[PDB]
Amino acid sequence: RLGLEATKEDNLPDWYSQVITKGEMIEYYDVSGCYILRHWSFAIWKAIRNWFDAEITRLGVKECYFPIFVSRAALEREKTHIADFAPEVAWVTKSGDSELAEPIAVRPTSETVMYPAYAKWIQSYRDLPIRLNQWNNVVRWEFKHPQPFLRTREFLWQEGHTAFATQKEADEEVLTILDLYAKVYTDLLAIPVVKGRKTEKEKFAGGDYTTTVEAYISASGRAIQGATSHHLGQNFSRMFDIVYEHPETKEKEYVFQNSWGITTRTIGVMIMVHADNQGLVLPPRVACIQVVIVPCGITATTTDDERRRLYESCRELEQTFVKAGIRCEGDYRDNYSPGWKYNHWELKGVPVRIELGFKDLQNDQFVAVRRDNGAKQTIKRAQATVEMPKLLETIHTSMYERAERDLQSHTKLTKQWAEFLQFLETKNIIMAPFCGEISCEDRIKAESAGAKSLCIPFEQPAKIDPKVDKCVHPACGRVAKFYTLFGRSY
Amino acid sequence: LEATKEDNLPDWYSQVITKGEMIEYYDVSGCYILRHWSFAIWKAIRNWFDAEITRLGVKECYFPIFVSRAALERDFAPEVAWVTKSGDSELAEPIAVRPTSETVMYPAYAKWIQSYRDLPIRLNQWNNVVRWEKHPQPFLRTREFLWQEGHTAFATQKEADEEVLTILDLYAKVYTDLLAIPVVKGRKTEKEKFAGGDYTTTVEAYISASGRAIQGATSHHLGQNFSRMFDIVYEHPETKEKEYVFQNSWGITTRTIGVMIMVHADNQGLVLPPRVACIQVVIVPCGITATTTDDERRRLYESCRELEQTFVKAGIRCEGDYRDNYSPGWKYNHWELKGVPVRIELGFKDLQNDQFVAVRRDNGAKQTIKRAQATVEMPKLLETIHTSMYERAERDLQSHTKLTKQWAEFLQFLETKNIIMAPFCGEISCEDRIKAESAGAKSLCIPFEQPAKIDPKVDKCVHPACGRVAKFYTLFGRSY
Ligand SMILES: O=C(C[C@H]1NCCC[C@@H]1O)Cn1cnc2cc(Br)c(Cl)cc2c1=O
Ligand SMILES: O=C(C[C@H]1NCCC[C@@H]1O)Cn1cnc2cc(Br)c(Cl)cc2c1=O
Ligand SMILES: [Cl-]
Ligand SMILES: [Cl-]
Ligand SMILES: [Cl-]
Ligand SMILES: [Zn+2]
Ligand SMILES: [Zn+2]
């Protein structure tokens, strides 16, 4: 029965709403900007969270929890960014019917609370480094048009905050966290990305520099930051008097800080990239169910003893899949036809469906069907334990390389501004030589109406030969500092 | 440690949670920073329970932190935090920070249950709620706190009842098997039960320093009350009479940690139950004789590293302390304060005789183990520690639960700092009079394991103003 009524290419938003609802991944909510994560998508987040947490604790980071409320003073004292952020802050100002003396803010991030804590907690050189992480929820009252995973007012993330004695420690951590974020996207979500440094405009305002992983959703034609990992350097230490006495040098020494974060926006990217016109398509490594066994060949008058015999062999296959470490469940609901179940689990996006009927068990075998391809492969029951991991391996690769192919089909390089704007009009992203200065990024953005910097990619396409190369914008005559990636932004 | 449990309980509690690196104070009242050392106790409880209820068929989801006014108001009302402005721009309708999630998840349950085919719904959340509720205290009276709230809907009341009991069994197992704290399973009286429910089961535990009892977790049977409120119904297949589902909800909060502090922490700081301690064993290398020798520094640190490595690989959570800028005794006191179940003192004579001394945080008892037997004695040891803690608490609690049918000794026992099983009518009127004329004592639970069977030919409720035949024996005490 249930099915997608729209298509990715013609009506992307209604397609997206149909895939997150009929994929049982989201329920809408009477508070705007906020969405119910039903269990089918929360398991995606749970896999991402668990994987990344295991990584950063193996690294020596530790898990903590600061309160959801922040003082007006914690917030505004020594402002990180008066910026244009203060409007986006959710303010509690009444208990029941009693208004409170000073109002308290729901956290948008925890710098202004965790940095005073670090100032207390570091009274000597011996107390360093501090590597603390929280898995928490934040609220940003963002005046834009909201969407389930991509622009939400409350969302889950993890924020890691770190303080070291040396800048070398801090630099290397920034890159180790970025490698793990990159792994979240490629190895778990089968999504390709570009590692880079934000330009001076797009960097976190308070940081020394800001690294990032950036991805592209081509169906929409827009690019999106997938995760970031900042090097604050000494800015916040000097702000918050996070100091120790140098063991040799008698003089006060400020610590070197990093912060890094990744949000549930990841899941939205996963949809936009991998979900097709029949519904969701889950990367095998985050799917709550990797393999679903639908017992087939049950007619309106299949008998309870026949039904039970088949159900029982299905549970035995499901069990030897669990014991092989792969996440398999069987669907034994009696008020649903085999075909109804095929369509159900297709909408839900399970990498593999197993059709096992009476004719299959009589030949001691089964059929496996890929959610991405529709490709069917008959496996002898014996080879199950060895064939099914290969398959799930294969499925990931196909999902990934397909996605990367699309990304490379939507990355065009030019040194000429006209070819830049042609490429941008044709719905893709452009590596071009950029002076790096903020004014020129502004002129570029205005004059593509718009196109923002994405990152200065780590893998540069070529080294700028200064005898020739000038920044792609004709109004600045600055020689090109590097290749930068520009595109229309989310 | 500067104060003591026996004489000044509150400032002892404050010194135990501060010098234990568990809590950092915060400029919003009611709210406290869970540092990593206490957050790990929560994480152990969280993971143990989540695995259990996941094995049971419950599934994890996450609903928003915000409820807007309409969702909510469909009697606690003073205690609700209201967002009403973004920045300096006032918002049209104000939204409440969730204090519990019934008013949000139950409309969703009505929308998602379009047929009988859709049952049961078994969903759990690990989330933060705020109830702007006195004189606050870090794990016992917090305005923002962590918990898990699970909400479930079935077709029959039998499923729902049996689940209530299974979850209560799991909470008691949290308290006894993980936190080594004894508890009593029971039913709240109609006065103390969850207002919207049919009934409320509970586990209660005893803190002897205070002489007071505290509710450790709950598991409610909402019956058909909330289904009827929010129209969670299905078509009866036979005659299509709208049928209301039977609902339960259950919860457990970070109050556990506070209970575990107050039950088990002594005058030297925390002492963590082995099954929740982030570090079960900490290795302190001894005898570094301050530049008496330097090459040996790495040699000793290295033998400590292979012992820690074989403890990890044996499944024992062991970390070693190889920091050079701290006195050995400083490390002893540090890990005593933080409550690490076992300290290993390992020196040069120890490494030369192929052994180590492990000393229990609860006992102070010292026991020298040959490295050969290490992987085998150390699990036993930690098993041994848990039992001694639990039985210790058990001893204490049962030396302080008194049975009576007479109000005079009820009120004497209540002066002597313990909790009383007495015959009770069950009425709300009479419970109110009991608390008022005991100043004060509330019902705790009607225990499942009853002390003797009520003979209605004689037994009357212990309060002299109600002459009702006693409905049952219940447990009363002074409580948080
Ligand atoms: O949130 C950040 C910076 C970093 N915080 C720690 C986790 C990783 C993260 O990149 C950027 N940022 C973004 N949005 C914000 C919104 C508001 Br409102 C405020 Cl006050 C502040 C901020 C703000 O600082
Ligand atoms: O929160 C509860 C009832 C149950 N909710 C689901 C998880 C288990 C839990 O016992 C009781 N309770 C307690 N304190 C409250 C405080 C406020 Br404020 C509000 Cl609005 C409501 C409540 C409220 O309903
Ligand atoms: Cl977001
Ligand atoms: Cl930013
Ligand atoms: Cl509490
Ligand atoms: Zn330029
Ligand atoms: Zn009575």
mmCIF file of C-alpha atoms in Angstrom, chain A residues 27-31 34-39 42 46 49 62-71 74 86-87 89-96 100 104 106-107 113 120-121 126-127 132 137 139 141 154 156 335-336, chain B residues 24 26-28 31-36 39 43 46 50 59-68 71 77-78 80-87 91 95 97 104 108 111-112 116-117 123 128 130 132 144 146 325-326:
data_model
loop_
_atom_site.group_PDB
_atom_site.id
_atom_site.type_symbol
_atom_site.label_atom_id
_atom_site.label_comp_id
_atom_site.label_asym_id
_atom_site.label_seq_id
_atom_site.Cartn_x
_atom_site.Cartn_y
_atom_site.Cartn_z
ATOM 1 C CA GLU A 27 6.620 12.903 12.982
ATOM 2 C CA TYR A 28 5.665 16.575 12.757
ATOM 3 C CA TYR A 29 5.193 18.749 15.802
ATOM 4 C CA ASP A 30 3.100 21.630 17.106
ATOM 5 C CA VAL A 31 6.248 23.657 17.872
ATOM 6 C CA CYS A 34 11.201 20.991 16.085
ATOM 7 C CA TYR A 35 10.583 17.409 14.977
ATOM 8 C CA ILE A 36 10.048 14.016 16.563
ATOM 9 C CA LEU A 37 12.841 11.550 15.785
ATOM 10 C CA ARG A 38 11.026 8.240 15.701
ATOM 11 C CA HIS A 39 13.091 5.199 16.491
ATOM 12 C CA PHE A 42 17.248 7.705 16.022
ATOM 13 C CA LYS A 46 22.740 6.118 17.720
ATOM 14 C CA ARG A 49 27.124 8.648 18.105
ATOM 15 C CA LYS A 62 36.142 12.126 28.484
ATOM 16 C CA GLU A 63 32.315 12.437 28.644
ATOM 17 C CA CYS A 64 30.630 15.059 30.861
ATOM 18 C CA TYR A 65 27.393 17.097 31.038
ATOM 19 C CA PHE A 66 26.848 20.828 31.651
ATOM 20 C CA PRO A 67 23.380 22.258 32.328
ATOM 21 C CA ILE A 68 20.902 23.171 29.586
ATOM 22 C CA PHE A 69 20.515 26.691 31.036
ATOM 23 C CA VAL A 70 23.127 29.453 30.786
ATOM 24 C CA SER A 71 23.291 32.718 32.725
ATOM 25 C CA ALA A 74 27.912 33.669 31.286
ATOM 26 C CA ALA A 86 22.124 37.338 20.101
ATOM 27 C CA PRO A 87 18.745 37.447 18.291
ATOM 28 C CA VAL A 89 18.804 32.880 21.699
ATOM 29 C CA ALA A 90 15.905 31.175 23.465
ATOM 30 C CA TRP A 91 15.220 32.968 26.743
ATOM 31 C CA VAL A 92 13.382 31.533 29.681
ATOM 32 C CA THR A 93 11.900 34.395 31.624
ATOM 33 C CA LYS A 94 9.101 33.003 33.777
ATOM 34 C CA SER A 95 8.634 30.135 36.233
ATOM 35 C CA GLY A 96 4.964 29.224 35.936
ATOM 36 C CA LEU A 100 12.483 35.571 37.191
ATOM 37 C CA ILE A 104 18.307 32.307 31.598
ATOM 38 C CA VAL A 106 18.807 27.631 26.596
ATOM 39 C CA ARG A 107 22.292 26.714 25.373
ATOM 40 C CA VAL A 113 29.992 27.827 30.460
ATOM 41 C CA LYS A 120 38.942 26.905 37.593
ATOM 42 C CA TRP A 121 40.115 23.452 36.792
ATOM 43 C CA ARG A 126 49.897 19.270 35.933
ATOM 44 C CA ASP A 127 46.191 19.634 35.095
ATOM 45 C CA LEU A 132 35.969 16.881 27.538
ATOM 46 C CA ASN A 137 20.897 19.160 22.717
ATOM 47 C CA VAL A 139 18.526 25.338 20.537
ATOM 48 C CA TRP A 141 16.062 30.202 17.180
ATOM 49 C CA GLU A 154 16.440 22.144 18.537
ATOM 50 C CA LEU A 156 21.304 16.921 19.007
ATOM 51 C CA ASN A 335 -1.983 -9.508 8.992
ATOM 52 C CA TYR A 336 0.392 -8.481 6.188
ATOM 53 C CA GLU B 24 31.059 21.625 39.752
ATOM 54 C CA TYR B 26 27.029 26.638 38.558
ATOM 55 C CA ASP B 27 25.539 30.133 38.432
ATOM 56 C CA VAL B 28 22.008 28.874 37.733
ATOM 57 C CA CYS B 31 21.700 23.083 38.184
ATOM 58 C CA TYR B 32 25.083 21.453 38.566
ATOM 59 C CA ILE B 33 27.810 20.336 36.191
ATOM 60 C CA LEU B 34 28.184 16.571 36.028
ATOM 61 C CA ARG B 35 31.934 16.172 35.710
ATOM 62 C CA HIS B 36 33.235 13.067 34.023
ATOM 63 C CA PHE B 39 28.695 11.120 34.545
ATOM 64 C CA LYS B 43 26.593 6.080 31.870
ATOM 65 C CA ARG B 46 22.187 4.073 31.316
ATOM 66 C CA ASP B 50 19.122 0.353 27.917
ATOM 67 C CA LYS B 59 12.871 1.060 21.303
ATOM 68 C CA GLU B 60 14.691 4.348 21.662
ATOM 69 C CA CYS B 61 13.375 7.634 20.228
ATOM 70 C CA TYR B 62 13.674 11.347 20.966
ATOM 71 C CA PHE B 63 10.826 13.945 21.205
ATOM 72 C CA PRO B 64 11.562 17.680 21.519
ATOM 73 C CA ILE B 65 12.691 19.522 24.615
ATOM 74 C CA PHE B 66 9.875 22.043 23.930
ATOM 75 C CA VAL B 67 6.112 21.761 24.473
ATOM 76 C CA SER B 68 4.024 24.649 23.475
ATOM 77 C CA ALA B 71 0.082 20.641 23.949
ATOM 78 C CA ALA B 77 1.770 24.366 37.055
ATOM 79 C CA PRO B 78 3.955 26.768 39.147
ATOM 80 C CA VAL B 80 7.310 24.918 34.616
ATOM 81 C CA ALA B 81 10.039 26.823 32.759
ATOM 82 C CA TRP B 82 8.706 29.081 29.983
ATOM 83 C CA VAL B 83 10.635 30.371 26.986
ATOM 84 C CA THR B 84 8.854 33.505 25.789
ATOM 85 C CA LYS B 85 11.407 35.541 23.841
ATOM 86 C CA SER B 86 13.991 34.844 21.164
ATOM 87 C CA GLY B 87 16.749 37.410 21.755
ATOM 88 C CA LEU B 91 7.366 35.252 20.655
ATOM 89 C CA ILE B 95 6.671 27.259 25.021
ATOM 90 C CA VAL B 97 10.664 23.251 28.769
ATOM 91 C CA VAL B 104 3.803 15.362 23.713
ATOM 92 C CA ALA B 108 1.724 11.015 18.598
ATOM 93 C CA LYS B 111 -1.848 9.477 15.439
ATOM 94 C CA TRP B 112 0.287 6.344 15.013
ATOM 95 C CA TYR B 116 -5.151 -2.935 16.204
ATOM 96 C CA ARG B 117 -2.255 -3.983 13.930
ATOM 97 C CA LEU B 123 9.264 3.501 23.312
ATOM 98 C CA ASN B 128 16.825 15.887 30.162
ATOM 99 C CA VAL B 130 13.486 20.515 34.044
ATOM 100 C CA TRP B 132 11.617 24.206 38.568
ATOM 101 C CA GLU B 144 17.394 20.118 35.495
ATOM 102 C CA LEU B 146 18.758 13.406 33.386
ATOM 103 C CA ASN B 325 54.391 15.478 39.379
ATOM 104 C CA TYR B 326 52.446 13.969 42.315
#
